[PDB]
Structures are given as structure tokens and as C-alpha cells.
Symmetry: C2
Subunit: 337 residues, 2 copies
């Protein structure tokens, strides 16, 4: 584990040292106060995350680019491209903050909870989104992959936004609509809202930056990475509930657990779920959890984990079109901890 | 004014006839319900406007294109470009709808006031933005001017968004901040928030579609159109207050009337302004109007109107770079009625 922990320690360090200049480039005439605000706004919201997708975008580029092309100039560009994915993520996080009434995030108060923002938070998000596209043009307009980069940041915005709509259908009456809690509906929410921009975007951008725009190479990659995206979400689902210290449950969220509990429940075990899911009481949340252990979900998942791991391993090694296996094996092995 | 009225009747008719084929092309697999929503959502929000910007885009393209290129295929393209500008305007209107608590608009209730939307109105705005970028891709990705079209839509979102920040500084604590009510600040608010995307974008898109990207031919057009943009704003401000059937005043808006009143006010006359501007009461509103008449604002405007007209007229005929004068004279004359 020592090489990994050290190269990560300095990869993250190189990456964090490029942000300051992204800010500075976006601020250097009628409205100088708007440029000051875009500074504050970027420095509070974008660089304080765990930086997974940004790091994934640069990790992917190193793994995919030809060695005679791993120049400090191309490294910095893979690096600025990471910060464009982080910006896109911040845009998404901030819109959802206002939509869902989030109070605390990144261990600090949500941007919109400041007195002089409130719903004006929505415009502040529009400023981050625009900074992203400005930054995308200033670093990349000269590149022959430039159109496909803008198309992918655009396709990804569509994909998240359909993803949020399908999710909202799942709350009719500030109470969850359990009839919609199917594995087709959870797989689709998970794919659109999370997997596209969290797992594919970083890798399809790194592929583009490499001059690889082969349509079949892109599908091949996406096919595996979306599965991987679903796995991450299921595991996320199982630590929210059976975590070792999550509000999914008192929140009536569409989880893998609630979908699989409904597949296996007696009409009597369905009735307890209707009565106790998405209710913010220790009792209701405790009842839902007794039932989760009664339908043997911890075992069921354990078996799912072991098997799905071997399926995706087998599916990696059957990937071709020049793509490195050691990239997908590395994304699998990291989202398995 | 019969040919203009008849050509304008069938131009509006040709344009309205393209909209349904724009919707049907955005709706023809995991989330079929999201495609049905996007249709409902375009159908209520985008084509029910007075359609000025979308009409301005096609009017400018017919004026700017060489005649041997005025083919039904190129006309249909100009006509989908108009609908992409309107989709930009709808995005802007809806975000503003939620931010300012608008209740009615276009003779119907605002989207976000429906029970199944509320703050989810913000994601429906992202869906409209995405549709625009998709629609831009499926029609224009072949063209060499494609990269420049995306950049213009991106730049215009930056500009609106800085314009919206600068506007929010003017209402501190629900009381208007009369220290900031200067002509420099009103000109910048109007330019960033309205003029750029209402008066420039249409013409610069039509110029791009024509194959003209000359930096200096864009600059000349941009100067004139920004000034015309500011004029339409000053006129709109005047009728808002002196118009023959306006809530600016009770709303503490930075209008040309309040800015110029503060330039001419006696210190006593600044007091009546600090005591009666942004106060929703028949007495305060009526007092701001007694002052506006006392300071002789109807006259000053009347002089401003006549003078600014002859200035722009003259600035039009000074324009070269092959640009048609008959385009600018027509915009000038149509915002002078």
C-alpha cells in the first residue's frame, strides 16, 4: 500500500496547487465587484471536497496518454480538466442544496444559508457553471477535441437533470411512493443522476484529451464504468444503513435495501414498510432496520458483493480497443474498501 | 406599414411552425417519463412569448446572408437558432421566477407555482438549458461556426449571471440602497442582465451563421446594439411609471427615473426619495411621482428621446465592415413606437 499512499499524497498535492491560478485567470471592467464575488464563491464551494472525479480525470489521463506526451504542459491540462469536472459537480451540489434544504456540507454551512444569498444561491450556481465553460474555452479552444469536450459537459448536464426528475417522482405526498421502488427505477436514477458524471465523464474526457474519439472505444469504457458506478452506489446504500459511524430511511430515499426488501417481503412485511419508511422517528427507523435484518439483507448483500466483484473482474479482462485493464482494475479495487 | 405588417405576420407563422419539430426531435430509453416531462415543460414555457429575440435572429440572418444562400434549408436553420435563443431566455425567466417569487407570467401561472414543482422548478430550468444545447448539437455540429455558437451561448450565460449579482447589491435588507443608484451602475445592470442577450446575441449568431467571425465586424455591431439595448430599457422604465394602461417604485428598482431624480434632487428632495422609494403604499408611490413631475422628468426624457435618436441614427450611418444599415435602422425604429 506504500507506493499508492505516496503517489496519491503528491498527485492530490500537484492538483490542489493548480486551483489558485484557475481563480486568478477568471479575475484579470464595468462590474469589478462581480469578479471579486466569483473569487469568494469559487474558494468556498469548489476546492474543499474529497476531489474524487477531478483526481479520477488526471489519474485516467496518465494511464491513457502516450509516454512521449506526458509533458508538464499536458499534465497541467489534464489537471485543469479535473477542476472543470469539480466545478460541474459543485454546480450540481449547490442546485440540490437549495432544492433539498441542506443546512451543512463539507463540514461548513451551505452557501445558500448565508443571509445575503438565500434563493439568490441559484444565480451563484449559474456563475460557477459559467466559470467552468469560460475556463474550458481559455485552456482548450485551440485543441481539436474541443467540440467533444463541450458536447460531453452538455450531455452530462442533460443526464443529471433527467436523473433528478425521475428521483422526485419517488416522493408523492412528502411520503415515499413505494410502488415505484423497483430495481429498473433505482438502476436508472443511479445511472443518470450519479454514474454518468462520477465514473464515465472523467475517463471519456481523459480519452478525448488523448485524441481518442473512437465511438466503440467510448461505449466499451462506459459499459464497464456504469456497472462500477452502480456497485459504488449499492455499497454506499449498505453503509448508510449498516454503517459503522446516514439518514436514508427517515428520508424515504430510493435505496438498494428498500428495493430488495420489497422484492422479498410478505404482504405483512410490505405493510410495516408503508407505515415506517421515510418517517423521522427513532422508532420507525429502528423498525425498518429490524425488518432489514429479518429479510436477511446483510447476508444477501455480502453474497451480491463477492459475486458482482468477480463478474466485473471477468468483464474488465474482456475489454479491448487498446484500453489499459490496470485502469478499470484500479477503479474496481478502490471502490471496494 | 402594411408590407411590414404582412411579412411580419407570415415570418411569425413560419417560426411558430418549426417549434413542434424541435420538441418531437428531443422525444424520439431507460427513463421514457423524463422525455414526456421535457415535452410538457417546453410546451408551457418556451413558445408562448412575444418571441422578439428568436424573431430578431431570423430577421438578421435574412438581412446578413447572401441571396444565393437564402435556401429553405438555411432558413430552417436560422429558424431553429431563433428557438435556441428563446430557450436561453426561458431558462433566464424561470430561474428569475423562483428567485423573485413571480406568481403569473405570459397570462398563466409561473411553472414553479404548480404543486408538483415548487423548488424543483430549478431542475426543470436545467432541463430546458440542456434541450437548448442538445438542439444546438443536432442541427449545427457539422458547421465550421459550431464552436463559436456554443461559446456565444456560454459567454451570454456568464454575462446574465454577473448582471443578476450586480442587481441584487441594489436591494440591501428589503430597502433600496440609494447610495448605489448611479448611471454607471444602472448602465452596467442593463448591459449585463438584458442588452447582451436581448440585442447582441441574435445578431452575432446570425453573423456567425453567415460565416462572418471577423472580431472587428462583431465589435461595431455590438457597440450600436448595446446602446439601443440601454435606450429600450430607459423607455421601458418611463412607461412603467408614466405608461398608459408599473410596480417599479413600490419595488425600489434601479430605474433611469430614480437615478436621474437623485442627480437633480435638492438634499430635501433626496429625503422624500429615502422615505418613499421601495414602500408598497398608494401615498409613498404617489409622492415619488409628485417629485418626478416636480423635477421635470417627463420633459428631460422627451429631450433625451429626441436627442438619443439622432445620435444613434448618425452612429448607424458611420458603420462599415459590409454590415447592412437597413438592419440597425429597423431595430432602432421598432424600439421607438
Amino acid at each position: 500500500n506504500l507506493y499508492f499512499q505516496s503517489m496519491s499524497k503528491d498527485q492530490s498535492r500537484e492538483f490542489m496547487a493548480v486551483f489558485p491560478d484557475i481563480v486568478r485567470d477568471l479575475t484579470e471592467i464595468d462590474v469589478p465587484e462581480a469578479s471579486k464575488w466569483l473569487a469568494k464563491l469559487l474558494q468556498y464551494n469548489v476546492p474543499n471536497g474529497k476531489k474524487n472525479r477531478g483526481l479520477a480525470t488526471i489519474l485516467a489521463y496518465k494511464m491513457l496518454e502516450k509516454k512521449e506526451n506526458l509533458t508538464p504542459e499536458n499534465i497541467l491540462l489534464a489537471n485543469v480538466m479535473g477542476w472543470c469536472v469539480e466545478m460541474f459537480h459543485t454546480h450540481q451540489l449547490l442546485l440540490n442544496d437549495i432544492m433539498e434544504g441542506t443546512t451543512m456540507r463539507r463540514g461548513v454551512p451551505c452557501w445558500h444559508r448565508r443571509p445575503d444569498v438565500g434563493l439568490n444561491g441559484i444565480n451563484d450556481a449559474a456563475l460557477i457553471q459559467s466559470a467552468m465553460y469560460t475556463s474550458l474555452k481559455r485552456h482548450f479552444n485551440s485543441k481539436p477535441y474541443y467540440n467533444y469536450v463541450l458536447e460531453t459537459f452538455n450531455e452530462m448536464l442533460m443526464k443529471c437533470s433527467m436523473g433528478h426528475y425521475v428521483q422526485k417522482l419517488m416522493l408523492k405526498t412528502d411520503k415515499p411512493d413505494l410502488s415505484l421502488f423497483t430495481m429498473e427505477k433505482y438502476e436508472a436514477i443511479t445511472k443518470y443522476k450519479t454514474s454518468y458524471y462520477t465514473f464515465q465523464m472523467p475517463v471519456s474526457l481523459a480519452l478525448l484529451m488523448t485524441g481518442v474519439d473512437d465511438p466503440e472505444t467510448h461505449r466499451q469504457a462506459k459499459t464497464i464504468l456504469l456497472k462500477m458506478g452502480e456497485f459504488f452506489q449499492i455499497q454506499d446504500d449498505f453503509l448508510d444503513c449498516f454503517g459503522d459511524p446516514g439518514t436514508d430511511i427517515q428520508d424515504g430515499k430510493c435505496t438498494w435495501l428498500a428495493v430488495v426488501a420489497l422484492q422479498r417481503a410478505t404482504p405483512a412485511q410490505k405493510q410495516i414498510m408503508e407505515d415506517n419508511y421515510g418517517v423521522n422517528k427513532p422508532e420507525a427507523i429502528a423498525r425498518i432496520k429490524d425488518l432489514y435484518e429479518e429479510l436477511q439483507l446483510p447476508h444477501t448483500y455480502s453474497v451480491f458483493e463477492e459475486t458482482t466483484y468477480d463478474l466485473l473482474r471477468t468483464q474488465i479482462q474482456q475489454v479491448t480497443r487498446g484500453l489499459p485493464h490496470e485502469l478499470f482494475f484500479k477503479i474496481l479495487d478502490n471502490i471496494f474498501r
